[PDB]
Amino acid sequence: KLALNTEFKKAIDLATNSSKNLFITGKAGTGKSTFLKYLINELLFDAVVLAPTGVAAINIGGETIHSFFNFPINITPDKIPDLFIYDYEIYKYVNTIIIDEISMVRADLLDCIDLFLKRVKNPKLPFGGTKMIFIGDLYQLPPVLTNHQKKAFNMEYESPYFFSAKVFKEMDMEFIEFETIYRQSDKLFIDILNRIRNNTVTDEDIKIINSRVQDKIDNDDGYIYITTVNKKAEEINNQKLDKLKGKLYKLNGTLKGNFDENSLPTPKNLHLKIGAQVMLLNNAPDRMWVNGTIGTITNIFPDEMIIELALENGNIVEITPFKWDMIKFTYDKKEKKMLSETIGSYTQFPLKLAYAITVHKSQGKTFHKVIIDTSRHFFAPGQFYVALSRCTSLDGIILTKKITKNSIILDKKVVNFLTNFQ
Ligand SMILES: Nc1ncnc2c1ncn2[C@@H]1O[C@H](COP(=O)(O)OP(=O)(O)NP(=O)(O)O)[C@@H](O)[C@H]1O
């Protein structure tokens, strides 16, 4: 039911017929998710799909990288050879292994997959000779810190980011980018995002971005506070909910089978009040709401199990609990095949308090009106770009504090690596 872009048909050809080592990239919202959705279902295809984190795998209907390869948490590329492989026969059946949100996987973690695949498969070809499709826009790099949040492995890695994987320097994968925009296609905003990606920001860009700074906000309704501090975001949602009048409703999620309670999209104990600012987590088929749409609860119906909210201006919708599937790829020793099957179900309203969110937890979502916490002196490499990528237009963006071109410093380091990808 979707249009096939000229770069969409180029990517499905190189992946479904001339399948060899492809890399889908682009900007935030350019079609990479629907391209992967169109490959697995609504098309004749079979392949494993992996994601770095458990919550990422639940959204795309895949399974964790560590879960698929039975990797321990402490796995390093040096522990791969001294790692006893059971169920060795099953790995010779998997081809075209697709990884999603590739920018989020570590450098060492990606080389573990190569060395693991080289064991169960041809030991000379990269990744054991399996077709590697990587998706997830390239400039959504995870945040790093110098004193905090390190493991500092410096054996041969220039950086913990994905591109520093040694498998790349001995591989050819003919990268393909998705450059077509949508969804509040603010061109001036898009071009500023392009120059931040290119690290070619002009002084007029900084003047335009700083024009969105506001120390005061009248009618903050509809705005979501995007910060980096996981602590601060939780305080804002809870404080905003206490200041709301009305009965507190406690809705409980049904956890069937074997599901990871540490990867729940929305809390099992959902505390909501009529009037709360909530966020939809379901990306509806009829395009009424996307994953990240902000609404306001207008009524709660516990008996009928229906939560009513006006989606913005007046787009009133009725929401029922949604079911998430826990996908696990298993080798059927009887039918000799791999096709994926659910091991657990989590059912709960696709809703979450949306007064504030963190950059890490807002992955994949785009909002309409954001309040970005730019009180930090510096932004970790590529962390300002990901904050702006969570919004759809410059008119929706509000900055708490004015930034300078020195704030986007340490982007210079990574951009010289990302340009090497040719
Ligand atoms: N080729 C296309 N033709 C028509 N509509 C499209 C196309 N690609 C994307 N869209 C629309 O734009 C939305 C964004 O694409 P989507 O595949 O969801 O990427 P995303 O998850 O929003 N973020 P990203 O993976 O960075 O692109 C989709 O939900 C569609 O509504």
Beta-carbon contacts of 101 under 8 Å, excluding residues fewer than 6 positions away, are 51, 52, 53, 56, 135, 136, 140, 363
Expressed in angstroms, the distance from the first to the final Cα of the chain is: 33
For ligand 1, the distance from its centroid to the CA atom of residue 348, given in whole angstroms, is: 25
Does residue 33 have its Cβ closer than 6 Å to ligand 1?
yes
CA distances from 336 to 85, 94, 116, 219, 339 (A): 19, 11, 22, 60, 10
Amino acid at the residue 56 = A
Q: Which of 184, 186, 131, 180 is nearest to 2 (CA)?
A: 180
Pocket test of ligand 1: the residue of 182, 197, 280 to mutate, having most ligand atoms within 8 Å of its CB, is 182
In testing the pocket of ligand 1, which one of 7, 24, 27, 30 has its CB within 8 Å of the most ligand atoms?
A: 30
The residue whose CA has the least distance to atom 21 of ligand 1 is 33
Taking the CA of residue 33 as reference, the ligand 1 atom at the shortest distance is: 17
What are the binding residues for Mg(2+)?
46
* Cβ within 8 Å of residue 95, ≥6 positions away: 47, 130, 131
Kindly state if the Cβ of 34 falls inside 6 Å of ligand 1. Answer: yes
Distance CA 362, CA 317 (A): 22
Residue nearest to atom 11 of ligand 1 (CA): 31
- Report the alpha-carbon distance of residue 353 to residue 237 in Å, rounded: 6
Using an 8 Å Cβ cutoff, are 61 and 68 in contact? no
Half-sphere exposure (Cβ direction) of 326: Cα atoms closer than 13 Å = 19
Tell me whether residue 196 is exposed, middle or buried, using C-beta atoms within 10 angstroms of its C-beta: 0 to 12, 13 to 18, 19 or more: buried
Which method resolved this structure?
X-ray
Strand positions, DSSP E, 42-87? 49-51, 63-64
Q: Which of 2, 34, 290 to mutate to test the pocket of ligand 1 (most atoms within 8 A of CB)?
A: 34
Contacts of 292 (CB under 8 A, 6+ apart): 279, 280, 281, 362, 364, 365, 366, 367
C-alpha torsion sign, points 100, 103, 108, 114: positive
